């Protein structure tokens with residue numbers, strides 16, 4: 001286990017770019033990490049965004065969030081660059097603004113400030 005609840009991470013999920021997240025406990029399983037059905041470790045994350053979402057992400061697709069400028073280092077992992085669709089970019093910028101604020105808080109503060117409320 002490399003990450004704990006409240007840690008800030010970048011997650012690369014599906015067709016989306018590296019996105020700012022917070023590691024959190026799954027509301028149903030009550031664990032923030034598990035071994036999946038393929039025997040790989042996954043972490044449960046909340047995505048920072050105007051649209052609240054959560055996901056279980058493979059450990060190879062999770063990186064420590066040190067700051068927004070780390071994004072260039074993540075892409076690096078003629079020069080070819082994918083375009084940045086304006087609508088997605090605006091939501092990513094909003095997520096980054098939250099992560100930048102969360103980075104200035106302690107773990108306990110971030111947990112209190114950002115942990116989602118799940119309603120059945």
Ligand SMILES: Cc1noc(C)c1-c1ncn(C)c1-c1ccnc2cc(F)ccc12
Pocket residue numbers: 013014016017019047048049050051052053054055087088091092
């Ligand atoms: C959508 C969605 N629904 O479930 C999940 C899980 C996702 C998701 N998977 C990866 N990312 C980065 C997201 C996502 C989460 C929150 N906000 C967003 C805003 C966007 F513009 C674009 C993607 C996202």
